[PDB]
Design a protein around this ligand. Structure first.
Ligand code: SUV
Length: 478
C-alpha cells in the first residue's frame, strides 16, 4: 500500500493549512474590524470555528486511518473524534440554516446580535446533544496468531438500528435543511433580483435638460394648465390596492377649498371603468385636473417625474415602492401611504407619509405640500435623490451578500453529497457487501472532500466579499 497515497497526504496537508489559516483569518477579520459586525458575519464566524475544530481534531486522525486502515488511538478517542466530527457537521448545517433564515426574514419580510448569540448557543447545544448516539455506538474491535490490529467502527446490535440511524443522520445533517435553505434562497432570489431593484442607469436627472422650473413650465404649457404646484398619480385604477379612489375622494374634499385653485393634478392609468369614469367626471368638472388613460413611454414618464412637484402614492398595499424610487431619483417629492415598502424608503426628510386609506389625511398632506411649495424645495428634492440612490445601493449590496451565501450553500451541498450517498448505500441498503479497493478509494476521496469544504469557505469569502478580501489583504501584508 498504496497508490494515490502521496496525493492524499499532499491534499490533506494543503486542506489543513488553508483551512486553519483561512478560518482563523475569518474570525480575526470579523473580531478586529467593527464594520464587519453583522448577524451574517457572526454566524460566519461560528461556521469558521466549527471548521477549525474539525480541522484540528479530526482531519489528521482521518488521514492516518484512511492510510493505514487501523486505529492507533485509544477507545476514548474512538468515541470522541467521530463525535466531534458529527457535532462539527451539525453546527455547520444549522449555522447555514440560521443564516438563510435570517436573510429570509430580513429580505422577504422586513434580527439583533443578541438574537444571533442565542441562535449560536442553541445551535451548539442541540448539536452536542443529538450527536450523543454517535459517541455511544463507536467501539474498538480487535482483529486477528502473531499479530492483531484494532479498528474503530460503529457497533450495532442488529441490522435495523444502523439503517434507521443513518437515514436519520442523512435527513437531519443534509437533506431537510438543504431543502429548506434552497426554498428560502430561491424565494430570496425572486425577491431581491426579480421584484426589487430599479434601472438606475435610466432613472437619473442627467438625461433631462434645463432647470426644473423650465421643465415644469413646459409641462404645464403642454397640458394646458396655469402655473401652480403640480401633483401626479401614475398607478393602476384599483379599489384597495393603488388607492386612486383615495386620491379622487380627497380631490373632491379639496375642491371646495380656496387652495384647490392653486393645485394641479395629473392622474394617469387604466383599470376600473367606474373609477375611470369618476376620474373623467372630475376632469370635466375642474380645469386643474387632467386624466391620462393612454399608454406612456418610459421616457415621457421620466420627463413627468422630473417636471412635477409631488408624486402621490396612496397605495393600500405596496411591497415595492419602485414608483417612489423612480420619482425620487428625478427629484419628485413623494406623498405616500405609510405601508411597508413606501414606509421603508420614505422618511420625514424625504417625503410625506399618510394613513393608507384616509382621504382626509391625504387631502391634509396635499395642503401641507402646497404650503411647503410656497418656498424653496431644493434641499427636499436633493434629499429624495440621495435617499433613493442609497436605497438602491443597499439592494445591490444585499444581492452581493446573498449570492455569496448561496455559493457557500452550493459548495457545501456538493462537498457533502458523495459521503452522504456512500453512507446511505452502505449503511441503509447494505451495498459494498462484496472489489473493495475502489469503494475504499471513493470513501477516502469523500472524506478528503468533506474536509476540503472547510478550506473552501474562506476563499469564497475572499472572491465574493469585498470587505473580507480587504481584511485578508491587510492580514498578509508583511
Ligand atoms: C471521516 C468522516 C468525515 C465525514 C463523515 N461524514 N459523513 C457525513 C457527514 N460527515 C464521516 C462519516 O462517514 N461519518 C461521520 C461520523 N463517523 C466518523 N468516523 C470517523 C472516523 C475518523 Cl478517523 C474521523 C471521523 C469520523 O467520523 C462515522 C459515522 C459516519 C456517518 C466520516
Amino acid at each position: 500500500p498504496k497508490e494515490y497515497e502521496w496525493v492524499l497526504i499532499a491534499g490533506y496537508i494543503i486542506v489543513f493549512v488553508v483551512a486553519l489559516i483561512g478560518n482563523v483569518l475569518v474570525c480575526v477579520a470579523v473580531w478586529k474590524n467593527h464594520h464587519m459586525r453583522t448577524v451574517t458575519n457572526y454566524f460566519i464566524v461560528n461556521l469558521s470555528l466549527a471548521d477549525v475544530l474539525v480541522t484540528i481534531t479530526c482531519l489528521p486522525a482521518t488521514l492516518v486511518v484512511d492510510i493505514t486502515e487501523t486505529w492507533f488511538f485509544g477507545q476514548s478517542l474512538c468515541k470522541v473524534i467521530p463525535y466531534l466530527q458529527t457535532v462539527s457537521v451539525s453546527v455547520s448545517v444549522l449555522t447555514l440554516s440560521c443564516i438563510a433564515l435570517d436573510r429570509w426574514y430580513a429580505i422577504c419580510h422586513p434580527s439583533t446580535a443578541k438574537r444571533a448569540r442565542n441562535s449560536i448557543v442553541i445551535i451548539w447545544i442541540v448539536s452536542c446533544i443529538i450527536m450523543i448516539p454517535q459517541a455511544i455506538v463507536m467501539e474498538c474491535s480487535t482483529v486477528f496468531k502473531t499479530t492483531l490490529f484494532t479498528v474503530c467502527d460503529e457497533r450495532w446490535g442488529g441490522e435495523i438500528y444502523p439503517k434507521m440511524y443513518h437515514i436519520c443522520f442523512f435527513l437531519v445533517t443534509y437533506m431537510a435543511p438543504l431543502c429548506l435553505m434552497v426554498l428560502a434562497y430561491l424565494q430570496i432570489f425572486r425577491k431581491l433580483w426579480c421584484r426589487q431593484g430599479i434601472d438606475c442607469s435610466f432613472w437619473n436627472e442627467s438625461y433631462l435638460t434645463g432647470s426644473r422650473d423650465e421643465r415644469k413650465k413646459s409641462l404645464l404649457s403642454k397640458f394646458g394648465m396655469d402655473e401652480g404646484v403640480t401633483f401626479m398619480f401614475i398607478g393602476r385604477f384599483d379599489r384597495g390596492q393603488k388607492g386612486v379612489d383615495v386620491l379622487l375622494k380627497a380631490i373632491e374634499i379639496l375642491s371646495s377649498k380656496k387652495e384647490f385653485q392653486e393645485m394641479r393634478f395629473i392622474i394617469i392609468g387604466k383599470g376600473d371603468p367606474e373609477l375611470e369614469g369618476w376620474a373623467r367626471s372630475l376632469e370635466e368638472k375642474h380645469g386643474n385636473v387632467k386624466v391620462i388613460t393612454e399608454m406612456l413611454s418610459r421616457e415621457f414618464v421620466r420627463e413627468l417625474y422630473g417636471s412635477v412637484d409631488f408624486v402621490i402614492i396612496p397605495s393600500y398595499f405596496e411591497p415595492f415602492g419602485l414608483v417612489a424610487l423612480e420619482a425620487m431619483c428625478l427629484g419628485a417629492i413623494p406623498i405616500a401611504s405609510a405601508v411597508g415598502g413606501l414606509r421603508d424608503i420614505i422618511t420625514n426628510e424625504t417625503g410625506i407619509l399618510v394613513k393608507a386609506g384616509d382621504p382626509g389625511e391625504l387631502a391634509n398632506a396635499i395642503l401641507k405640500a402646497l404650503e411647503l411649495s410656497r418656498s424653496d424645495l431644493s434641499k427636499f428634492r436633493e434629499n429624495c435623490k440621495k435617499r433613493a440612490m442609497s436605497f438602491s445601493k443597499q439592494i445591490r449590496a444585499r444581492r452581493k451578500t446573498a449570492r455569496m451565501l448561496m455559493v457557500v450553500l452550493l459548495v457545501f451541498a456538493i462537498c457533502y453529497l458523495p459521503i452522504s450517498i456512500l453512507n446511505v448505500l452502505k449503511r441503509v441498503f447494505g451495498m459494498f457487501a462484496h472489489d473493495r479497493e475502489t469503494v475504499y478509494a471513493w470513501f477516502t476521496f469523500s472524506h478528503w472532500l468533506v474536509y476540503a469544504n472547510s478550506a473552501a469557505n474562506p476563499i469564497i469569502y475572499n472572491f465574493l466579499s469585498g470587505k473580507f478580501r480587504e481584511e485578508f489583504k491587510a492580514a498578509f501584508s508583511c
